[PDB]
Amino acid sequence: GSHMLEMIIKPRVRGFICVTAHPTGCEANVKKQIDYVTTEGPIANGPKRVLVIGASTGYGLAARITAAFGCGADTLGVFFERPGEEGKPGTSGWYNSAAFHKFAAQKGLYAKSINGDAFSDEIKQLTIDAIKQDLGQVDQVIYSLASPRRTHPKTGEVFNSALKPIGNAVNLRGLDTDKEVIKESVLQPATQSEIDSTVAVMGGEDWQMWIDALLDAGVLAEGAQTTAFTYLGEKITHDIYWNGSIGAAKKDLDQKVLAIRESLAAHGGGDARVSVLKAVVCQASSAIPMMPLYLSLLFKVMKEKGTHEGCIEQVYSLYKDSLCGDSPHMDQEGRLRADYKELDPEVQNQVQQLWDQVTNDNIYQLTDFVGYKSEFLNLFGFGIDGVDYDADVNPDVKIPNLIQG
Numbered sequence: 517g518s519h520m521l522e523m524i525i526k527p528r529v530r531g532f533i534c535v536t537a538h539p540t541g542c543e544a545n546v547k548k549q550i551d552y553v554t555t556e557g558p559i560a561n562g563p564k565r566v567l568v569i570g571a572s573t574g575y576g577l578a579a580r581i582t583a584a585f586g587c588g589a590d591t592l593g594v595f596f597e598r599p600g601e602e603g604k605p606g607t608s609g610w611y612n613s614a615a616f617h618k619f620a621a622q623k624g625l626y627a628k629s630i631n632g633d634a635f636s637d638e639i640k641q642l643t644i645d646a647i648k649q650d651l652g653q654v655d656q657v658i659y660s661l662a663s664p665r666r667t668h669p670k671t672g673e674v675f676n677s678a679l680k681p682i683g684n685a686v687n688l689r690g691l692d693t694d695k696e697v698i699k700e701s702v703l704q705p706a707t708q709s710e711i712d713s714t715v716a717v718m719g720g721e722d723w724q725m726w727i728d729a730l731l732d733a734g735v736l737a738e739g740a741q742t743t744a745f746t747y748l749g750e751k752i753t754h755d756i757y758w759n760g761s762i763g764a765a766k767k768d769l770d771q772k773v774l775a776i777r778e779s780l781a782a783h784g785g786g787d788a789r790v791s792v793l794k795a796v797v798c799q800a801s802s803a804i805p806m807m808p809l810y811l812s813l814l815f816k817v818m819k820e821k822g823t824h825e826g827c828i829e830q831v832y833s834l835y836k837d838s839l840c841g842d843s844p845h846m847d848q849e850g851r852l853r854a855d856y857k858e859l860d861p862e863v864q865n866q867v868q869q870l871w872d873q874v875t876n877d878n879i880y881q882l883t884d885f886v887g888y889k890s891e892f893l894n895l896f897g898f899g900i901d902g903v904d905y906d907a908d909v910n911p912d913v914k915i916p917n918l919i920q921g
């Protein structure tokens with residue numbers, strides 16, 4: 517009986533985390549992003565050999581889809597995901613990458629992936645090995661890792677990032693998605709150890725190590741390009757992402773890229789940049805209580821303006837407008853910007869006006885909490901059109917050309 521090896525997969529939410537994922541819905545969600553890109557049309561003069569570090573979910577997945585199905589690129593992806601097994605759904609990123617390989621092959625595009633710790637030297641060497649064997653060199657490197665922790669590749673020290681202000685404690689309003697209550701909490705200021713640890717995790721060092729390992733091995737093409745994704749946001753989150761521990765990481769990202777840019781400028785006129793994207797629902801969003809509230813408000817306001825977007829819309833524009841086109845958004849430090857619709861003065865004024873009016877009773881009248889919840893479940897393959905959620909599936913979905921680290 518195949519029933520022993522198959523199961524009906526439903527969302528299981530534990531501690532603001534969805535701990536299941538649906539393979540059919542994840543495939544459909546990837547196909548929806550592919551179909552957005554092909555519907556919008558191809559992107560000319562893009563890279564044709566692309567390495568995406570953090571390629572399995574969110575903005576890195578969107579870059580992989582944009583490069584492959586927008587620019588026609590062969591893509592090598594690096595990620596850290598859990599395969600499925602009987603009775604135990606794997607992570608959404610695993611099923612997303614299975615669907616990506618499936619659809620890439622259908623269109624005669626190369627798709628190989630590496631599963632393991634991208635902060636390690638071992639994974640960097642496996643990645644170099646793949647490029648040498650298959651592509652020769654890569655034209656473009658997307659750096660799109662998000663992790664709460666980094667094991668230093670030389671010392672073994674485990675660094676943990678912190679989400680805290682610097683200087684004074686701050687009161688941050690938020691939304692508890694389990695209890696569905698508006699809830700303020702006070703974050704204490706970060707110690708210097710927390711600051712240094714957060715720079716080590718979310719700063720630019722590992723990005724630099726990647727480029728330095730790749731340039732040394734000759735697998736970066738002439739005219740190569742690399743970008744790292746980040747968020748800056750506006751006043752509502754600024755205590756954390758401007759002036760807080762994470763802001764220190766974005767500073768160190770701004771300064772480490774100067775070094776990376778110098779390394780690649782001497783390797784035949786290459787370049788390195790920081791790309792700033794808009795806030796989206798991601799799998800970590802519910803665990804940071806301010807983000808569900810901010811997103812629920814932002815979604816409603818931007819939907820009223822016709823400007824609401826998610827990952828694939830954002831990254832397709834980044835590629836078309838800035839990474840490959842002639843109408844870029846450079847900011848004063850020399851960053852590429854895709855977040856300009858989120859930072860519209862009137863949107864921000866409206867969100868900030870609503871931020872102070874939302875209460876437990878008008879949540880659904882003042883916010884798009886409905887949309888937040890739907891987009892959150894969608895990440896894990898739940899609530900997707902065309903999917904029969906009553907049908908058994910085998911959670912052990914396999915991936916060809918998956919190198920396990």
Ligand SMILES: NC(=O)C1=CN([C@@H]2O[C@H](COP(=O)(O)OP(=O)(O)OC[C@H]3O[C@@H](n4cnc5c(N)ncnc54)[C@H](O)[C@@H]3O)[C@@H](O)[C@H]2O)C=CC1
Nearest residue numbers: 570571572573574575595596633634662663746747795796
């Ligand atoms: N979520 C958001 O609202 C925004 C995110 N960003 C940036 O986009 C990038 C991706 O963030 P998200 O899409 O939010 O997160 P995500 O959680 O969707 O994806 C993170 C990626 O990193 C991979 N990863 C994590 N730890 C790894 C490790 N040790 N080794 C290898 N792969 C590992 C995951 O497998 C996945 O591919 C980040 O640089 C983030 O700062 C920028 C603007 C807003």
